[PDB]
Ligand binder design. Structure first.
Ligand SMILES: Nc1nc2[nH]cnc2c(=O)[nH]1
Ligand SMILES: Nc1nc2[nH]cnc2c(=O)[nH]1
Lengths: 159, 160
């Protein structure tokens, strides 16, 4: 664990004051939790996307994501470039191993450099923040946050 | 005024507003709050609004959160404080609600206003007054929202 790679990782952590605060409020959102408690009804996805789009106006991130527990399964949603994308989280051993590794930890949040699951040729530093509320299976009810490219992270280093 | 004596003081308040400012901005511009205002502030959904604010207050460690919403030309003031959801109508200019007209008449996205409280006048706070980007028909922001900070919370946020 060389000193220069601790400093880079530590320096990035200290830089993201606003993205971390919003990721925590999104993961713990009462509005999002209501939607999850209702069974993730498709009819309200436009409201969820508009809620996330409002947050992205405040932030300077490439994407916002929600990973919600429903009936024992994980449902992954993402707002990116105005499009609301969704898919089901896959079993362990597949491209969604980020979700099981984070939720198995005791960390309230983590910064994860990973390839994207909708566009694998893209990569981001994801702010994975867990909700305080857990589902019946022990997984967090909601894992949510932002995806940051290098340009946005470089602007946070300056500030 | 007198800078050098307040310069040590001034740095201390900025550490007070790193998280409280970000959440105040997201609350004022909240799509969830906006929908409620667009629906006419129906009383049936106040429990949802109060539960929504309770999540935010757990994150920030602040004494109070407030919402000042425009509806049919009048301002409606709501506050969550110590688990209680308080509400009243904003009064005309020249009264104790001059903070609202002075702020909304300005061009500032937000302001810090040291003022006595309108529900409990014996209390005072530094209020983070943040305006929504969307405006009502009268030109005032659809929503002004934010947190009220005591000295104790600011003194702790000072050390950090
Ligand atoms: N690939 C990937 N997608 C995510 N979406 C949210 N967090 C992550 C993550 O850590 N990795
Ligand atoms: N008295 C008072 N109450 C507020 N509630 C929200 N902002 C303010 C303010 O500036 N003054």
């Amino acid at each position: 664990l060389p000193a220069q790679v601790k400093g880079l990782a530590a320096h990035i952590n200290l830089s993201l004051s606003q993205d971390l605060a919003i990721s925590e409020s999104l993961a713990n959102s009462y509005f999002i939790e209501q939607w999850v408690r209702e069974g993730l009804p498709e009819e309200r996805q436009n409201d969820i996307a508009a809620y996330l789009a409002r947050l992205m106006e405040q932030l300077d991130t490439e994407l916002l994501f929600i990973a919600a527990q429903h009936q024992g399964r994980g449902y992954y949603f993402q707002l990116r470039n105005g499009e609301f994308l969704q898919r089901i989280i896959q079993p362990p051993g597949s491209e969604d191993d980020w979700y099981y590794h984070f939720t198995d930890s005791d960390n309230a949040y983590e910064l994860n450099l990973d390839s994207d699951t909708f566009s694998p040729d893209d990569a981001f530093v994801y702010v994975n923040y867990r909700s305080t509320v857990n589902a019946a299976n022990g997984r967090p009810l909601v894992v949510a946050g932002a995806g940051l490219d290098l340009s946005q992270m470089a602007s946070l280093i300056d500030d």
